[PDB]
Write a protein that binds this ligand. Structure first.
Ligand SMILES: [Ca+2]
Length: 1155
DNA sequence: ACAATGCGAGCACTGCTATAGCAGTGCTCGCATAGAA
């Protein structure tokens, strides 16, 4: 017992070691040390068998920021100790004591070099990261999915489950029963608020659970039966108006009758006031008659609660689980839970060993916060195992996360199993005066943390800090100062209004006296004025924080609640912005707009609003303004719009100058950052507006919508919670409400023998007594952390608090609080009895005063400022724009992201279809659009023009394409008709083209230097092409760069090369629309003519390039357009179109590019 | 074109029955009601 003062370098790196890193004892410096030792296998007898790799030293922390810092601190130490190995000389502690243990500085340098470059894979994860990691590796054993989705809901999944339970369980109930339930809970909402704690993590063991089968009906019967029989032993016993004590006035007849009418058709376990007329009491105030059965009724409770509950969480759990499986999702409780089952199951050894190898030695940090599930997994892998080491480090005095499931008991359990104990004796980080005061306080009684297994061993304060002191308006102040309210009695109300006031006063008192250089934090002969950034107010709950923030704010002392969870969505700004987006979204409606302008964010006046209502031209002015913002919104988005708005109305600049404006601004900006995300997830502005409403209505979701703290708060007295403060350090700290306690009423305790979480579904005084114990057992634990946060000094508020409505009978249930229990050494005290106990211990480091309230609204601080700024202004200019167009300088958008998702989509088609279904399928009735158009293009992507059209291949093509098989005849006949179709003249017909003379889907890139002006090109395009005579053209604007383009088909009729572009278009009824006229019409209609000139200009450049010494009119003679539809076996020139570029056009057009 | 409970105090008043103490009926009113992969 009583741990060995831990000497890192001499710690035996071999199996099971428990390390207690007291308050700020350098737990981190220790871990790193131990990490290095392991890497280089250092030590000696207390060393590890062999050297380990970065990817073998398992370290698990609880926080995410934790593993980051831990991972960071280590890469550094390695980089140093490694460097200090190359120099074989180091002049900085730790390292030197390390090199003395090194035998070959040259090797360690190498070994270390690897550890350095290996860090981006250091086995330092969180409890949760470790789990899903082992799990996902040994999937078979854990029955895990290779693709798990991390669930988020649950908080909802849970309510839904709790309600599914209420519907299938309570709805079918018959009135008599239903009502009973109702009087236990009104709805599913109420049932959850009672069982929510459970349902989460390890189900607690239910002391005295209901018979594994009692139905709601069962119990109900027994109860009603037990009730109704006594309705008899009174219905027929009410002929007795008996006799033989005092005080029961004849107004007992009032008592009497009140049960004769208690005879309803039942429906309510509820019964009333007969405690008197029992018998086991009538004597307390031969013994008496036949109604002592009542003595038996008010003996063992008449409830339905425990049964339902037991059924609820039991069923609710599995309901939620099932739902997760189905969804294929996984939560965190599950993550480390599934891992615990795996190590439990038969196939638990292959898993235990597997892990064990990967991580032969693991360091568990912040262990005082584990849980049965964790510790189990842990020992199931490393407990009693040669060739391995389990370094368990944390501090039981700081285990304050009970509410999330950190079971201090499972720690004490682990404390029992591992016999090797170690403590860190030196408290770096803090002042001697402090450490002395904290040690004194927690040394009062024995077992201050009241748990023989969690002893408190004082700690030596570090020498480098022996100089620390805090002087104020004269001399040095005591490390610890107790402020005591006056009086005998004191309610929770008082001890807050008054303590916050007091606290507030003392803060401005240090601050003001700080600017006057009278408040100094000094390290011997060095000093500095205390600044808001140095004060800190620990608190227990949101309210308490507010309570403080208010008294502070009442003294112009700005502050910031570091533990704030509210979301940006329920800020008055969110609402204002929404009204704005509604104005932007419709400046037409005179109302919503005015409304927008009325928002505090717009900083308008009452006068402004007025005039602006009586001047119609200035109104439209604004309307225009907003109509522009909607434009900015439609085109660039919300963020660009909002910022555009602010810049005009000069919002940011004004707000910042409006007290508390900075907060309001950051929040508005924030909203925008969220309103921006949401934008790129909905295709309509209105959809976003909607998006807002909901979020404003049902918020608090992620931590992504949590409020961003200001970058100035680093100069604001910080008010945080004992919890967020664990690990944090503060020059000066204040504990305004450190006396409160709040007694535990819920009978949830841990059995002191079996160390198990038991849930007595019956308020058994015995078990509640036990729980209430564990309560302050944790309050002390919190108290320890609170005092531990300050460096130079800490002053807390104490008062003769009293909860018991017992008229100040020398009560002061102060002894029921962690701090009171330590001051009044256990025993309760007089109001003044406290005042005397405080004086008892109180010198050099400890000192008290009376709660001296005060007033002086000023934080009497002034300012100065000189804004000599300006923003660089670039002297360059846009000028040219290099892009890569592609006969898209034509086709107006809509194809936005379309030519992106499908580079070869039949972009030339689009639309819907209707009643043109005529009961005889023809190529005109073939489904219109892009999806079907590309299907057609597809067919000819790899067809055997040469041979005949196999119907099965066609049936198969439609079958896969999602079309109806009943299209094969029409289609198989349609294809061929187009194949054996005569192109221009002498022969030429797709079917005559063999593979070797075909090149399908050619992708070209025609560089285009010297801006291509739409007009300049329209001129020559005119002179040579009679088609482009319909001159609307030049519909695009200047473009420098490249020219993409796909050619459906380019073939050669042994003599020349050609350009074929299959074009599935029209819904234009039949044949008559595919005539040499109609075709040449749609041609300009879609300006396809350009496609020609461009495409050919490419084939030109290509052929010229390939065919070494080629000529246009000797190798070209092409250009064929096949409008697939309207093409029959015997109606040539219909459906097909042909053109042959002027050759003189291609000439000028080619050089048009590079001049 | 719209507001939570519940618990005892606290004191006023009303029978009794060995003026006072103990009890009980009642209506009014102040008090205390989380934590953060
Ligand atoms: Ca085409």
């Amino acid at each position: 017992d009583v741990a060995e003062t831990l000497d890192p370098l001499r710690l035996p790196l071999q199996g099971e070691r428990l390390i207690e890193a007291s308050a700020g004892t350098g737990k981190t410096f220790t871990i790193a040390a131990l990490y290095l030792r392991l890497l280089l296998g250092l030590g000696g007898s207390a060393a590890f068998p062999r050297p380990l790799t970065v990817e073998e030293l398992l370290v698990v922390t609880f926080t995410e920021a934790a593993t980051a810092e831990l991972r960071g601190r280590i890469r550094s130490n390695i980089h140093e100790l490694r460097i200090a190995c190359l120099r074989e000389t180091t002049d900085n502690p730790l390292y030197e004591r390390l090199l003395e243990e090194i035998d070959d500085k040259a090797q360690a340098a190498q070994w270390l070099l690897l550890a350095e470059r290996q860090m981006d894979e250091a086995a330092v994860f969180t409890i949760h990261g470790f789990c899903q990691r082992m799990l996902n590796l040994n999937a078979f054993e854990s029955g895990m999915l290779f693709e798990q989705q991390l669930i988020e809901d649950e908080s909802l999944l849970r309510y839904q489950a709790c309600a599914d339970f209420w519907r299938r369980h309570c709805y079918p109930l018959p009135r008599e029963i239903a009502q009973v339930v109702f009087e236990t809970w009104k709805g599913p909402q109420a049932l959850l608020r009672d069982i929510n704690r459970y349902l989460q993590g390890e189900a607690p063991v239910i002391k005295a659970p209901p018979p594994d089968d009692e139905t709601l009906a069962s119990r109900h019967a027994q109860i009603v039966a037990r009730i109704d029989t006594v309705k008899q032993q009174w219905r027929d016993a009410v002929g007795e108006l008996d006799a033989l004590e005092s005080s029961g006035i004849d107004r007992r007849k009032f008592n009497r009758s009140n049960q004769a009418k208690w005879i309803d058709k039942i429906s309510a376990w509820a019964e009333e006031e007969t405690n008197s007329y029992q018998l086991p009491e009538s004597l307390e105030k031969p013994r008496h008659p036949l109604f002592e059965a009542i003595d038996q009724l008010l003996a063992e409770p008449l409830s339905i609660r425990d049964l339902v509950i037991t059924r609820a969480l039991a069923e609710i759990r599995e309901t939620v689980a099932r739902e997760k499986r189905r969804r294929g999702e996984l939560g965190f409780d599950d993550m480390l839970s599934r891992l615990d089952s795996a190590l439990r199951s038969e196939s638990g050894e292959v898993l235990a060993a597997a892990i064990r190898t990967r991580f032969p030695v693991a360091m568990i940090d912040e262990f005082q916060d584990t849980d049965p599930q964790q510790y189990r997994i842990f020992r199931r892998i490393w407990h009693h195992q040669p060739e391995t080491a389990l370094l368990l480090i944390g501090d039981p005095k700081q285990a304050i996360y009970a509410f999330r499931g950190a079971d201090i008991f499972t720690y004490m359990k682990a404390r029992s199993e591992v016999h090797a104990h170690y403590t860190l004796d030196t408290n770096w980080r803090s002042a001697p005066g402090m450490v002395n005061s904290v040690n004194k306080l927690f040394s009062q009684t024995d077992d201050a943390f009241m748990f023989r297994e969690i002893p408190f061993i004082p700690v030596k304060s570090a020498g480098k800090n022996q100089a620390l002191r805090f002087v104020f308006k004269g001399e040095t102040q005591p490390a610890m100062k107790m402020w005591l309210m006056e009086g005998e009695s004191c309610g929770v109300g008082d001890y807050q209004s008054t303590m916050a006031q007091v606290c507030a006063a003392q803060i401005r008192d240090w601050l003001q006296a700080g600017q006057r250089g009278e408040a100094l934090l000094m390290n011997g002969d060095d000093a500095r004025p205390v600044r808001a950034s140095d004060i800190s107010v620990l608190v227990r709950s949101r309210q308490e924080a507010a309570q403080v923030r208010d008294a502070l704010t009442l003294l112009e002392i700005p502050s910031v609640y570091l533990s704030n969870r509210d979301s940006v969505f329920e800020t008055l700004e969110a609402q204002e912005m929404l009204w704005l987006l509604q104005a932007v979204m419709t400046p037409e409606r005179e109302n919503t707009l005015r409304s927008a302008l009325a928002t505090s964010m717009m900083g308008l006046n009452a006068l402004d609003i007025e005039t602006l209502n009586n001047d119609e031209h200035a109104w439209d002015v604004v309307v225009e303004e907003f109509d522009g913002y909607r434009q900015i919104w439609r085109k660039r988005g919300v963020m660009p719009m909002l910022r555009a708005l602010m810049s005009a109305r000069n919002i940011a600049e004004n707000l910042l100058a409006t007290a508390g404006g900075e907060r309001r601004l950051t929040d508005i900006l924030h909203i925008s950052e969220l309103l921006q995300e949401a934008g790129t997830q909905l295709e309509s502005e209105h959809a976003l507006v909607r998006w807002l409403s909901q979020h404003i209505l049902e918020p608090d979701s992620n931590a992504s919508s949590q409020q961003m703290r200001l970058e100035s708060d680093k100069h604001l007295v910080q008010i945080v919670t004992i919890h967020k403060s664990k690990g944090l350090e503060y020059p000066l700290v204040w504990l305004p409400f450190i006396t409160n306690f709040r007694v535990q009423e819920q009978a949830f305790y841990h059995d002191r023998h079996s160390f198990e979480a038991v849930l007595d579904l019956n308020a058994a005084p015995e078990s509640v007594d036990l729980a209430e114990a564990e309560r302050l057992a944790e309050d002390l634990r919190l108290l320890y952390v609170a005092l531990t946060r300050s460096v130079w000094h800490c002053s807390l508020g104490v008062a003769p608090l009293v909860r018991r409505r017992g008229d100040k009978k020398g009560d002061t249930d102060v002894h029921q609080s962690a701090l009171g229990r330590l001051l009044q050494k256990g025993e309760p005290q007089d109001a003044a009895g406290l005042r005397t106990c405080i004086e008892a211990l109180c010198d050099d480091d400890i000192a008290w005063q009376t709660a001296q309230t005060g007033d002086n609204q000023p934080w009497q601080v002034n300012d100065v400022s000189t804004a000599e700024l300006n923003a660089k202004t670039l002297q360059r200019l846009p000028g040219d724009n290099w892009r890569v167009t592609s006969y898209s300088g034509l086709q107006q958008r809509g194809h936005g992201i379309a030519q992106d998702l499908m580079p070869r989509l039949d972009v030339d088609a689009a639309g819907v279809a209707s009643v043109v279904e005529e009961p005889t399928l023809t190529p005109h009735q073939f489904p219109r659009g892009a999806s079907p158009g590309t299907f057609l293009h597809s067919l000819f992507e790899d067809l055997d023009f040469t041979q005949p059209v196999d119907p099965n291949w066609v049936r198969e093509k439609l079958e896969l394409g999602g079309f109806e098989s009943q299209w094969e005849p029409v289609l198989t006949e349609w294809i061929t008709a187009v194949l054996q179709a005569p192109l221009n003249e002498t022969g030429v017909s797709l079917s005559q083209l063999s593979a070797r003379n075909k090149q399908v889907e050619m992708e070209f890139y025609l560089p285009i230097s010297e801006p291509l002006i739409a007009s300049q090109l329209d001129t020559l395009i005119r002179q040579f092409d009679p088609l482009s005579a319909g001159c609307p053209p030049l519909e695009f604007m200047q473009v420098r760069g490249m020219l993409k383009g796909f050619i459906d088909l380019v073939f050669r009729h042994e003599g020349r090369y050609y350009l074929l572009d299959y074009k599935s278009n029209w819904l234009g009824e039949d044949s008559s629309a595919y005539t040499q006229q109609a075709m040449a019409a749609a041609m300009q209609a879609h300006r396809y003519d350009l496609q020609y000139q461009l495409y050919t200009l490419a084939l030109h450049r290509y052929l010229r390039h390939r065919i070494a010494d080629y000529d246009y009119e000797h190798h070209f003679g092409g250009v064929i357009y096949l409008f697939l539809r309207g093409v029959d076996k015997e109606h040539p020139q219909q459906g097909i179109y042909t053109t042959r570029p002027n050759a003189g056009l291609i000439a000028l057009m080619d050089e048009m590019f590079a001049g």
